[PDB]
Design an enzyme around this catalytic site. Sequence first.
Site, PDB file in Angstrom:
ATOM      1  N   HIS A  72       1.241  11.392  -3.998  1.00 39.34           N
ATOM      2  CA  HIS A  72       1.285  10.520  -5.189  1.00 39.34           C
ATOM      3  C   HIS A  72       1.314  11.293  -6.545  1.00 39.34           C
ATOM      4  CE1 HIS A  72      -0.058   7.598  -2.048  1.00 39.34           C
ATOM      5  NE2 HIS A  72       0.660   6.742  -2.757  1.00 39.34           N
ATOM      6  N   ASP A 113       2.066   4.621 -10.306  1.00 41.12           N
ATOM      7  CA  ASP A 113       1.025   5.362  -9.550  1.00 41.12           C
ATOM      8  C   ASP A 113       0.351   6.411 -10.400  1.00 41.12           C
ATOM      9  OD1 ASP A 113       0.768   4.284  -6.915  1.00 41.12           O
ATOM     10  OD2 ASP A 113       2.341   5.535  -6.084  1.00 41.12           O
TER      11      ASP A 113
HETATM   12  C1  LIG Z   1       6.774   8.687   4.719  1.00 41.20           C
HETATM   13  O1  LIG Z   1       5.598   8.004   5.164  1.00 41.20           O
HETATM   14  C2  LIG Z   1       4.907   7.106   4.343  1.00 41.20           C
HETATM   15  C3  LIG Z   1       5.231   6.837   3.014  1.00 41.20           C
HETATM   16  C4  LIG Z   1       4.489   5.940   2.261  1.00 41.20           C
HETATM   17  C5  LIG Z   1       3.396   5.284   2.825  1.00 41.20           C
HETATM   18  C6  LIG Z   1       2.536   4.327   2.050  1.00 41.20           C
HETATM   19  O2  LIG Z   1       1.615   3.800   2.645  1.00 41.20           O
HETATM   20  N1  LIG Z   1       2.749   4.139   0.736  1.00 41.20           N
HETATM   21  C7  LIG Z   1       1.924   3.315  -0.036  1.00 41.20           C
HETATM   22  C8  LIG Z   1       0.583   3.617  -0.224  1.00 41.20           C
HETATM   23 CL1  LIG Z   1      -0.040   5.040   0.520  1.00 41.20          CL
HETATM   24  C9  LIG Z   1      -0.277   2.847  -0.973  1.00 41.20           C
HETATM   25  N2  LIG Z   1       0.226   1.763  -1.582  1.00 41.20           N
HETATM   26  C10 LIG Z   1       1.528   1.443  -1.472  1.00 41.20           C
HETATM   27  C11 LIG Z   1       2.387   2.222  -0.708  1.00 41.20           C
HETATM   28 CL2  LIG Z   1       4.073   1.746  -0.515  1.00 41.20          CL
HETATM   29  C12 LIG Z   1       3.080   5.541   4.140  1.00 41.20           C
HETATM   30  C13 LIG Z   1       3.832   6.453   4.892  1.00 41.20           C
HETATM   31  O3  LIG Z   1       3.552   6.740   6.192  1.00 41.20           O
HETATM   32  C14 LIG Z   1       2.565   6.011   6.918  1.00 41.20           C
HETATM   33  C15 LIG Z   1       1.178   6.414   6.439  1.00 41.20           C
HETATM   34  C16 LIG Z   1       0.752   7.508   7.392  1.00 41.20           C
HETATM   35  C17 LIG Z   1       1.421   7.173   8.698  1.00 41.20           C
HETATM   36  C18 LIG Z   1       2.652   6.386   8.375  1.00 41.20           C
HETATM   37 MG   LIG Z   2       0.396   2.851  -5.518  1.00 43.52          MG
HETATM   38 ZN   LIG Z   3       3.874   4.334  -4.969  1.00 42.61          ZN
END
Ligand SMILES: COc1ccc(C(=O)Nc2c(Cl)cncc2Cl)cc1OC1CCCC1
Ligand SMILES: [Mg+2]
Ligand SMILES: [Zn+2]
Length: 323
Positions: A72, A113
């Site tokens: 992030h 973010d």
């Molecule tokens: C490329 O992999 C990923 C990318 C983004 C996210 C994800 O959770 N993003 C997100 C988060 Cl962490 C918090 N708020 C909104 C969003 Cl969209 C999650 C991802 O992978 C998941 C989390 C760990 C296992 C699979």
């Molecule tokens: Mg976020």
């Molecule tokens: Zn985001």
Amino acid sequence: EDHLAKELEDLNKWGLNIFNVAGYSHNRPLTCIMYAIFQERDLLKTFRISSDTFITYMMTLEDHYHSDVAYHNSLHAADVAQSTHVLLSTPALDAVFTDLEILAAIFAAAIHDVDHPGVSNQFLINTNSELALMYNDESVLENHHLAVGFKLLQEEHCDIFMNLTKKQRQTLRKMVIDMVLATDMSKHMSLLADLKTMVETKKVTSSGVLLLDNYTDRIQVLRNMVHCADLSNPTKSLELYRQWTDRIMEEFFQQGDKERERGMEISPMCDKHTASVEKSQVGFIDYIVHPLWETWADLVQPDAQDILDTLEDNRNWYQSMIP
Ligand SMILES: COc1ccc(C(=O)Nc2c(Cl)cncc2Cl)cc1OC1CCCC1
Ligand SMILES: [Mg+2]
Ligand SMILES: [Zn+2]
């Protein structure tokens, strides 16, 4: 330079490689991409936004993302902003949005973010962090990102909307707050049920362009549009997707390590001693990303079929990497 310019020839394309833009912009991807996006779309001209003012705001915004947080950081904001820029040009959405709404969406992407500490809402709530106490456990981070982004607009050397009207600035702020609060994953399932209802009663003009009656309908498509951008990593080329995966896993595992050191329960996808990176991505696509994009594709069909095909191909790659 010559490489940055070749890479930005893909500015309006899904295939843009933001890691490359980062390399050629002094690790200031967010500032470079936001300035390219605003020039492409003539937003500085349209809203009399000073160039120096906009750059000064963007560099300050960027400097407020933490460079030692693996996922992030400013590269993710830059990616969500550029991805949002492309989504807004989707043929099915042509001429639907005012310039003001286009501005709020891309701005929202950019700040969405900011000042992220590399740990989740639940971790901040369970550790009694100052932020969780401040925001009463509700969309802790999201409220925080909005607060910082809008706070940075307070100094005059930084007010990029100083030339909007008062009605415009108020309308903007409403829209941005609404989009960023919609990036909170605890909202994902109802945003999707609401997106599915929007598909169900989709109306299009004779030229294949969506009909959005009032503000309620447009802000609904915009929240969902920033949410898809936020969840777009698996829809990009395999090469990019894997670097994003490496990054989210490094961040999640660091939290896992902090949970353990503090003797807290560890969330299974944050435990590096037992979690499969590959199974986790497959589940992430099967239960979250695919269900979402499939719905977006119906809304704007057939504009997102390429994206759906890439997503499916990427899903199958991670599955084949699982023994
Ligand atoms: C490329 O992999 C990923 C990318 C983004 C996210 C994800 O959770 N993003 C997100 C988060 Cl962490 C918090 N708020 C909104 C969003 Cl969209 C999650 C991802 O992978 C998941 C989390 C760990 C296992 C699979
Ligand atoms: Mg976020
Ligand atoms: Zn985001």
